[PDB]
């Protein structure tokens with residue numbers, strides 16, 4: 030991650046603002062539709078169109094993401110509480126993090142076209158991958 | 170990269186010592202034979218067994234690994250010259266890095282059986298995964 | 310593995326997809342998002358920054374060839390392995406491209422589709438295109454698989 | 455595609471393999487090095503520490519079955535998609551294991567063979583075994599294709 034990528038990421042998720050909680054909800058929904066095997070990680074959940082469980086969890090993913098962009102120079106310590114849940118408790122396969130980051134990138138491209146430029150895209154994919162790397166590292 | 174992992178890498182590369190130049194060259198030899206596609210990055214090298222170039226290059230990769238062990242807390246700035254050699258003028262796939270990391274672990278398993286414990290195996294793999302991403306970033 | 314509702318949504322959206330100006334940004338974004346893929350296209354010249362890659366006549370012209378290959382496979386979904394048979398050989402033994410990059414371009418193509426259509430590229434439409442990009446990537450990696 | 459020289463060296467080293475331990479050592483190491491794979495073995499018990507995984511009796515017993523499936527593949531190299539047909543159905547439809555974990559276990563097995571044979575596990579021998587573990591992983595993933 031470069032400071033040029035940091036300026037691209039801050040600007041991109043700076044334009045999402047309040048929509049992030051709904052963007053994360055769409056990105057979540059897209060993952061279950063595109064890659065059904067990911068639904069095993071949600072055994073009780075109701076994963077249908079326009080669900081408060083998906084919308085509420087969408088806000089959780091987006092709030093963790095807004096903290097990550099604000100703490101871009103300190104990600105393993107700021108996301109430490111989440112890195113323990115995803116790696117020790119949930120033990121999510123790192124492939125699923127590539128799948129959600131892809132759907133998140135799809136949602137950003139669909140809602141923000143003037144912002145989703147190849148320079149922003151490359152930085153966003155780098156940001157999400159480093160967020161994924163941090164989230165799926167605290168395990169042994 | 171927990172303190173337990175930093176302790177394990179020290180006890181693994183401590184028994185290596187002078188054998189670094191020999192182990193690094195073997196890891197390259199293992200990579201060229203098991204994965205013949207990686208050879209396309211070295212057409213200016215005589216990849217045949219019993220090469221002074223591979224023994225010297227192995228020593229360079231091994232001492233860069235020894236350099237990365239000391240700067241495990243701040244790897245992106247220490248291997249700055251490296252992260253520019255492979256990412257910009259060589260444009261190497263991170264898949265090839267996973268291959269060398271695997272070949273490095275195979276060499277260490279064959280030469281140091283007592284040191285190749287599952288905990289050290291997990292620590293070295295994680296350390297090499299961190300060295301790989303440092304070297305496969307800021308691409309432009 | 311595409312059903313009539315999925316197979317129709319794939320073709321209906323592809324009718325609006327401009328064959329000459331969709332693959333160019335897909336090949337371009339691949340070279341910007343995953344820049345190690347530039348080693349294969351270095352006869353092209355300058356790829357210094359994202360703007361240079363996007364504004365490269367050779368990049369956009371090669372994108373037409375890639376999207377052209379995707380388009381013929383979209384009509385021949387029944388036997389994708391036979392349709393991409395000649396390309397699967399050239400992409401694996403003639404020019405050593407790692408099979409991981411095939412699904413990287415596919416998932417980048419999906420990002421370009423959302424970027425162009427917006428709300429029109431809905432989750433079931435993405436789900437339909439995902440089975441296609443996985444299929445094409447698999448059909449282009451069989452010459453070792 | 456293994457050469458008769460690779461084929462012969464492959465059967466020679468495999469004949470000296472400790473059928474009772476190597477499998478469990480390989481399955482145990484996969485669970486420690488790659489800790490997400492632990493999700494598929496919750497009904498196995500204590501895996502909290504690296505010694506718990508290695509000492510675990512069902513990790514050893516299950517590893518014995520996995521090695522048996524590998525030995526099966528070595529005896530029928532020209533029919534891997536067939537030898538692993540039921541297991542490819544099990545791991546994809548019923549277990550939902552990501553095909554990337556097959557590539558990991560295959561590589562962990564290679565590390566185990568290196569740890570047990572030492573300098574006897576020479577680079578051309580590893581090269582031959584890489585063909586096998588790649589062949590087994592690819593055959594275990596055909597149900598996704």
Ligand code: HEM
Nearest residue numbers: 067070071089090091093094114119121125126129130160
């Ligand atoms: C961009 C990456 C991701 C972020 C930022 C993220 C964020 C979060 C957050 C904030 C929570 C709630 C944590 C809490 O308040 O205790 C959560 C829960 C969860 N996440 Fe993630 N997550 C990500 C990726 C994933 C992926 C890829 C999966 C699996 C496919 C996943 C599965 C879960 C599950 C299962 C829960 C708990 C839901 C439940 O109650 O069953 N997450 N995630």
Ligand code: HEM
Nearest residue numbers: 491494495519520523524549551555556559560590591594
């Ligand atoms: C690529 C090499 C692999 C081979 C040859 C292999 C082989 C086997 C075999 C022979 C079984 C026995 C099933 C039965 O009792 O009928 C088995 C079961 C299983 N395998 Fe695999 N496997 C491999 C990789 C994996 C990986 C990488 C995972 C997980 C990350 C995995 C998870 C399982 C699970 C969860 C079961 C079911 C065990 C149970 O009964 O609870 N396998 N595997």
Ligand code: HNI
Nearest residue numbers: 207210211229230233234254255259261265266269300301
């Ligand atoms: C297959 C490609 C490839 C991989 C995976 C790879 C992985 C690694 C890893 C990961 C563990 C490390 C620590 C590493 C270290 C080094 N490499 Ni890498 N290198 C690779 C291809 C090279 C090439 C090519 C050179 C330069 C050759 C030369 O002599 O100029 C190189 C040169 C080096 C040098 C010497 C730099 C110099 O001359 O200033 C070091 C040190 N490296 N390389």
Ligand code: HNI
Nearest residue numbers: 346349350374375378379404406410411414415445446449
């Ligand atoms: C990053 C590497 C890379 C990827 C991921 C990739 C992925 C794809 C995919 C989707 C998975 C498709 C459908 C596709 C289609 C094509 N590629 Ni690919 N190609 C790639 C690198 C090339 C290169 C390189 C060439 C030709 C260059 C040469 O040297 O001739 C190429 C040429 C083509 C051609 C033209 C054939 C010819 O030269 O006559 C088509 C069509 N392709 N390529």
